[PDB]
Every structure is written in C-alpha cells, then in structure tokens.
Design a protein around this ligand. Sequence first.
Ligand SMILES: COc1ccc(S(=O)(=O)N(C[C@H]2CCC(=O)N2)C[C@@H](O)[C@H](Cc2ccccc2)NC(=O)O[C@@H]2C[C@@H]3CCO[C@@H]3C2)cc1
Ligand SMILES: [Cl-]
Ligand SMILES: [Cl-]
Ligand SMILES: [Cl-]
Ligand SMILES: [Cl-]
Ligand SMILES: [Cl-]
Ligand SMILES: [Cl-]
Ligand SMILES: [Cl-]
Ligand SMILES: [Cl-]
Ligand code: NA
Lengths: 99, 99
Amino acid sequence: PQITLWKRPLVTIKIGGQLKEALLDTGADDTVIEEMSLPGRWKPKMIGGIGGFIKVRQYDQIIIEIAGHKAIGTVLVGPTPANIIGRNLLTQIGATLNF
Amino acid sequence: PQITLWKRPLVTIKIGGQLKEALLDTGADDTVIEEMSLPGRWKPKMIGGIGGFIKVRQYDQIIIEIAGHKAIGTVLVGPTPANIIGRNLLTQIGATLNF
Ligand SMILES: COc1ccc(S(=O)(=O)N(C[C@H]2CCC(=O)N2)C[C@@H](O)[C@H](Cc2ccccc2)NC(=O)O[C@@H]2C[C@@H]3CCO[C@@H]3C2)cc1
Ligand SMILES: [Cl-]
Ligand SMILES: [Cl-]
Ligand SMILES: [Cl-]
Ligand SMILES: [Cl-]
Ligand SMILES: [Cl-]
Ligand SMILES: [Cl-]
Ligand SMILES: [Cl-]
Ligand SMILES: [Cl-]
Ligand code: NA
C-alpha cells in the first residue's frame, strides 16, 4: 500500500498471538511494544527519546505480522506510550519513504 | 526520491539561514528541532515522547527547506536529542510511506 501522512500511520500487527495497533515509524531505529510477555530469553536495554530514557526488555528473533506481511527481528518491550514499528522491521517489509 | 530504511532517513534542512540534518519521522505528529533562535513570537506546548513529556516553544509559520522542498509551518523548539521532521511538514513536501 501507499499511505499518506495526514493522519498517524497506524496498522494492525500480530505479535505473540495478539492483535494490536502500531505506528509505522521511520524515526525509530527499533521496534518498541507496550508491556506484554513474549517467549524466550531477553536482556535489559535502555532506549531514549524525547522526554528521556526508558528501560525495556530486548527479545531477539520475534516474528511479527505487519499489515499482513511477516517480518522477524528484535522487539523491545516496555513502558512506551505507543506501539512503534521501527526501521529494523520496516526494512523487512520493503517500506520506503517517497517524495 | 525513494528512501529505504536500512539507515536513518536523514536529510538536509535549512532553517533561519542555517543548514542542519534532520530525521524524516513518520512517527512524529510535529516537527521538533534542537534549540536555536527563530523569529517572531512563540506559544507554549507540551509533547509526549517515549520518555515522557517536555515543554517546547511553538513557532508558527516558519520557513524551512527540506531536502530541497519548501515548507512553511509550525516548528517546535526544545531539548530533543535530534531534529525531527514530523507529519505536519512531511505532508507539505508530499511524502508517503509505501510497501
Ligand atoms: C532505540 O529505538 C528507538 C529509540 C527511540 C524511539 S522514540 O519513540 O523515542 N522516537 C525516536 C525519534 C524521536 C527522537 C529521535 O531521534 N528519533 C521515535 C519517534 O517517532 C517517536 C515515537 C513516539 C513516542 C512516544 C509517543 C508517540 C510516538 N515520536 C515522537 O517523539 O514524536 C514527538 C512526541 C509527540 C508524540 C507524537 O508526535 C509528537 C512529537 C523509538 C525506538
Ligand atoms: Cl501478554
Ligand atoms: Cl536509544
Ligand atoms: Cl523505565
Ligand atoms: Cl532486528
Ligand atoms: Cl531494499
Ligand atoms: Cl537532503
Ligand atoms: Cl544538525
Ligand atoms: Cl522540559
Ligand atoms: Na528470542
């Protein structure tokens, strides 16, 4: 699809067997999801943005379905105010910015 | 152009006669730039990012060149770790997200 940016670029994702809404976010290096459990091992990480840093759990090799496209990669889980699909997974579905 | 996301989508902007680098950020509603001087009056605004809320200065109707395209609109100035071009100006330059 092609998505204009008049509104937030929100899509449905499936992660951990759960359906969620998430922002397609070219300004995010990493994918960050609101608190939930994921299978497997994880390691702690700090990520920063406007407002400062938050502590997250880093899970590797997690599959997400992004608007019907499967991707695999690292997912950060923590007290983010929004679910964010970052560039590490956007590349996997071939997303580009065009102007 | 068409910009893939394997690297940060950084472009050159020109604002107040100064060249700067900024991130094209579909996850940002607003354009937020690092502290600098701008003409005119400003108004208060609070924005919420990943680490919490910050106060910024809202300057309206500021002329800003983005990757060679002219935009005129609202610019927020505050302690951001990076200059970010948000949807308010991405729509002016006609950007879309495609996959
Ligand atoms: C390490 O991987 C990550 C690191 C930081 C972030 S982030 O959420 O902090 N952010 C990073 C951006 C902003 C600073 C920078 O250099 N890149 C991604 C952003 O798209 C973020 C994503 C975001 C974070 C929190 C809430 C909503 C979206 N949006 C954002 O800060 O927008 C600001 C806050 C205001 C809310 C929406 O628009 C307004 C302007 C995401 C992944
Ligand atoms: Cl859960
Ligand atoms: Cl970070
Ligand atoms: Cl935290
Ligand atoms: Cl990854
Ligand atoms: Cl590619
Ligand atoms: Cl450029
Ligand atoms: Cl700069
Ligand atoms: Cl502040
Ligand atoms: Na894992």
